[model samples]
Target: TVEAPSVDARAWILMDYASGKVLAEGNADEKLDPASLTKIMTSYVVGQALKADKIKLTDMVTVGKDAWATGNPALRGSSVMFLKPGDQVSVADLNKGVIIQSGNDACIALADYVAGSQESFIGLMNGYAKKLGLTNTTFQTVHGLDAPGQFSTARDMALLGKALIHDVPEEYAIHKEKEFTFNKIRQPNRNRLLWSSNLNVDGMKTGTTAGAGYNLVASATQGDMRLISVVLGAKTDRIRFNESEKLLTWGFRFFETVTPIKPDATFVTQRVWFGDKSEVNLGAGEAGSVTIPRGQLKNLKASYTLTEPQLTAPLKKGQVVGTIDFQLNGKSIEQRPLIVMENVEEGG
Candidate 1:
């Protein structure tokens, strides 16, 4: 039986960043409201604009009346950066406000600045999503307010987070910040992982709404391994964050990304049936890796199935002759094509 943590969220997913593989998941493709988790894609779109030179961080945007009204602090439950109508703010600051404060108004101002209107920003967002091949996602709002058309699944959200990390590493750095102060106001980052020093957690987004419940897209790294976890539709913000933590912890504790073979090292040498040399160096075609469960290293074993007992040459380097199968406790874990690094000619 595959081991998985009994999580509280309705849907969740844990993914490996380097190999783009799903480590563990539950109902990952079930479409549901992403809430403010929508901002991951929003940040991605704005970051794309930044990369394309369509806008500059130093550019100034005047607070739109529409954006300002939604962010009124008097409204209980509204998260905002407290932008007053007519207040001119830097694009860089607004970007920070979006990530650190989860400011709805900040999302709007930057959306408008980049796409002329949030409606157009939706097009850019959906376009990018389509490009990413996210079939279960749709964008209905610039700031992830509950709406009929606004929907994404746990699996899709993890993909978005991974794309953000790969596409805009510089801007992604902003998410690691625990808090930001503006206009004499300081707000802590919504991502709880940043507050804890125990894990190598950094840079991600959180979302919550009455309809969407609590959602989190978080990532952590240990050694050369990185894991992204998405929890959707939990009962409380703390629950979602905690659940995400469990998934990351479970993955790092039970599994590891490993380089199973060295590119240049010889695993075995096979005698040539007819060649200038009697043997040819054989090993992995190139460096290869895999993610395996912990404590399985002792059970791990490699065996070769050579296609021929001996090879007649004029054989070229990187010629495939067989395969190396890795097994854990008698079960095949993975297989790699074995190749000779050096060439051998027919008997001299």
Candidate 2:
């Protein structure tokens, strides 16, 4: 069944999120039901909400009867938080429930809140999945319950895990959460990575379902390299976590990451359009590292440049404008599209 003899997993991949490259893989492209791995897509859509400010950590949500009668919260319980209708919950709480606890009710409430309905949210998920260049993925429900046509690949999961963390770092506290309290209930993150010191793991989510098996999108920062590994459709929890740690370990062993930038680290300041100040700081796209084998910095050369990424009248912090060159050993790799490091304010 496994096309890759090295990997014990039915489907799996070890990928470098920064380089958009797969280092080693085993049947990673094989199509299989994603089960709760479907929720990874939900996390992506919801992260977009956090970026756009469509929702906040403080927003309160009331559980509807339909939303309440969802999944089990117990460890042996299905990945559902058995919430009751009319019970008041908060966005922070829902975030906790959905991610740390894998609460199905939380997923339903979030989908309904953002996309008007769970159905529409699934539509958005599929659309966004396509836009993200996910070739083997589909969505049938907000909670990843089940659908014959719904499935994804380990390759796609790695891509998404990178995109989400690279795009919205603030949302990570939700994903990497070991535990959270809402409605006076304390829940621990299903991702054992939170507790494992050996893997050095701290990011992303996990998924499981009867039809799809178990899935994990895990990442860890070792040295300068931040690696992303996705394991989809595993036979056992022990195998899933063990494979992830091994994959990421192999990644670090095979590659060396070059850190080209950091926060407050400045490049050339750009001219502000009608601002109180003349120029704003052009930071990262100021600096970022590229992943390559150990001592391969000689292969990576990079530079910073700007585009006419002009925004509407009010330029705010974290606004996207231009990018820096991310290169590999003297070859053009990709663009580290820059964002405002601080709030520039409307009239600034």
Candidate 3:
């Protein structure tokens, strides 16, 4: 389905952020435990709660037993926000704890604080996963700890990553913060791409578990091109980071994408009968984009497929009349609804 690059990861994907098109992939649908990568969904649900006015940045959460149990003393090796049983933490700080700190305790605390109970909140997480159309994903833990029924695939994770960045950009920006200092303890983001200057990598999450291996969801933007890369089940953190970088680099090198059709820009005028005007202007109802293989742009073919050869009067503004399909090498890559720019009134 795409020009895939060879990768060493057990499951990996490179997706165009704006289009959600898979540029390259390798076993992207293999179901596996996503480890702490599950926190991305936890944060996404938090962002949704913020957007719906269900919670606020300043709301203080009372740390409960469930929250404390996800941390150091009980889950010894798990990440923690150093939260105590009675610590009253703000929603914003807990967000930082989830993203920058990868704090399992923060996930439990926020889950309970937002949804009344961790069990209920993780139910919401499954709901979010389903809404995102994650076919190979299931949530059994609010913190992404290995558990029965907890699994996700690279492609599905990339889809979730795209939604996290697009639906709640402001909240997603919190992931860009490299470090968060909580309880006098400082921890760097586990995503190593944030440490490099070669690519414009910003935010996403990292996951590592004894059974799941190291994983990363890395996002980057260059000019109008934004990409999200997912690598799962790598032997080491460095290998996961490097494989993701390789996938991203290969996509950038072989593909060029652009929003070629503006939603409102008139494309052509078509003949009409019994109308105030003899013609009606047509354009795309929505912006359209395409990713062409580099050096193959000239071979791109565009065709207008009209529903009717002749138009009658009384056509309403924004009515769909046809479709403009763009193709490369005979394969349809993108299409947009062909729309009338203005209402066509009945003739005198």
Predicted structure with the largest lDDT when compared to the true one = 3
lDDT of each: 0.83, 0.73, 0.84
The lDDT of model 2 is 0.73
Best by TM-score: 3
State the weakest 10-residue window (summed lDDT) of model 3.
68-77
By summed lDDT, which 10 consecutive residues of candidate 2 come out lowest? 69-78
Poorly placed runs, candidate 1 (over 4 Å): 70-77, 209-212, 259-289, 295-348
TM agreement with the true structure for every prediction: 0.77, 0.74, 0.85
lDDT of 1 by residue, 1-348 (tens): 258889898889998886566888899998887778888888999999998999999999998876776554332356777777799999999999888888888998899899999889999999999998788999988888777867889899888888899888877888899988888777888787887666889969887756648888899999889999998888987898788888999988988776667778788988887788888888885435567887676777888888987677878888888998888889987788888889887776
- For residues 1-348, write the lDDT of model 3, one tens digit per residue: 444768887888889876566788888898988878999999999999999989999998898877775443545667777678888999989989898888888888899889998789989999989998998999888888787878889999999999999888877998888887877777788777887777889979988755757888999887778999998888887898899888888888778776666667777789999999999888875446677777777878877888988889989888889999988889887887888988889999
Reference-based lDDT, residue 91, model 3: 93
lDDT of 2 by residue, 223-320 (tens): 65678888876688988888888788777766765666765766666666665565677666434645666676666666766667543335666676
Higher-ranked by lDDT: 1 or 2: 1
Kindly provide the TM-score of model 1 when superposed on the true structure, using C-alpha atoms. Answer: 0.77
Give the higher-TM-score candidate: 2 or 3: 3
